[PDB]
Design a protein around this ligand. Structure first.
Ligand SMILES: [Ca+2]
Ligand SMILES: [Ca+2]
Ligand SMILES: [Ca+2]
Ligand SMILES: [Ca+2]
Ligand SMILES: [Ca+2]
Ligand SMILES: [Ca+2]
Lengths: 242, 242
């Protein structure tokens, strides 16, 4: 049985010091009183609280891992998610009109195709490969192929959907309008980045797959105020949370 | 848990020093990260890596064994698969437009009907025997008859399929067009060679049978850089890997 004042601290630390909106406070309060009456277990209530921190936090953990091979340190996360120093950060004014999806896509393009940390590596790895293959291989890296089938979702139908011509056309226009790229190679390269972003979203929303399960456990550890692993130059998800 | 840099060395040695394409690197990378998250066992990941070396390598091991009675030595394999000296080799320019199937057929005709090593022996063994019998006996030699039935595949339906008149007609035209044979006996002889080739393909793609299981174990041994058996004048599969 959690007091509503415990669920707010659990939410605050997950959001790295951003105190929840008036609306969500009411949501948390419901989760509290549903545990006092035994209509909800303890672990269940805490999971739902941390599900609300998806857009703000999970966006920074997951993308950093996929592109740079390592999730950001606690100190680093602070900077990306909720800080005094970064004027524009994930839970700040700049981003208040981006949905969940467009947040993932934003982060991806930043890290991948720019002067971002992942540019040089991602540029060499995904050169001269087709849209179809980009999606198929990435799907398996993130969500697993065996895991998805056991979970009951049909892989083939999903991969086909992501790589259909209509989808690719939509992104091409999107990337051309938004990003300052004009070269034919860089646009091609950025579209792939946006696709992987779309997959990361699709993963974190369903809870299936290796990436999603590890990120969940990192946020759980981050909940109580202190991050146990907290290597100075980044925490590799798959090492730390088996 | 394999690092993606381990799976590439495992692939490279199997391909005898040919470094994988950009596309396949992405495939291997997925297999790595699926072992770090425990959505895939270790042995399973390594098998799938070596499954990718089928077209290049397994083609040289299996055909040599069937026609000359012995798989090529490590030094020999180098020459056939990936070398400086042989301008045209299996993982080189000449063969880049042949599918898996047409590779098997190519190797078979070479070794069997030409001035190839197997010509004299294969010529005496398969003279004055019908298409039906050629297929039936070969099926049993390669895939086993008991083994296939236990595996659940119905033998009778498969053998009939391979020896139907339509199939024979297709090959006759194929052999006439491609190979420099004009005599009525040599064409007949080459068609049989092409049939056995087709069976070798059908074997290595399903994983059933004695030939396929032994070739798999030879490639596994070849994976780590050094071939244990490595007799100078050839390795007999069935002796070395029981
Ligand atoms: Ca803070
Ligand atoms: Ca701020
Ligand atoms: Ca902790
Ligand atoms: Ca070599
Ligand atoms: Ca060569
Ligand atoms: Ca060895």
């Amino acid at each position: 049985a959690y007091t509503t004042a415990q669920l707010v601290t659990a939410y605050t630390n997950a959001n790295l010091g951003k105190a929840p909106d008036a609306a969500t406070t009411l949501t948390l309060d419901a989760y509290a009183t549903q545990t006092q009456t035994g209509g909800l277990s303890d672990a269940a209530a805490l999971t739902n609280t941390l599900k609300l921190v998806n857009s703000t936090t999970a966006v920074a953990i997951q993308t950093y891992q996929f592109f740079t091979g390592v999730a950001p340190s606690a100190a680093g996360l602070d900077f990306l998610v909720d800080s005094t120093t970064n004027t524009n950060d994930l839970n700040d004014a700049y981003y208040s009109k981006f949905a969940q999806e467009n947040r993932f896509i934003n982060f991806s393009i930043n890290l991948a195709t720019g002067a971002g940390a992942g540019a040089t590596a991602f540029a060499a790895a995904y050169t001269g490969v087709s849209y179809a293959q980009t999606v198929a291989t990435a799907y398996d890296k993130i969500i697993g192929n065996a895991v998805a089938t056991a979970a009951g979702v049909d892989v083939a139908a999903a991969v086909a959907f992501l790589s259909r011509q209509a989808n690719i056309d939509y992104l091409t226009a999107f990337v051309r309008a938004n990003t300052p790229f004009t070269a034919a190679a860089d646009i091609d390269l950025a579209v792939k980045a946006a696709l992987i972003g779309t997959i990361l979203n699709a993963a974190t929303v369903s809870g299936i797959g290796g990436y999603a399960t590890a990120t969940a456990a990192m946020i759980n550890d981050l909940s109580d105020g202190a991050l146990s692993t907290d290597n100075a130059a980044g925490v590799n998800l798959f090492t730390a949370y088996p």
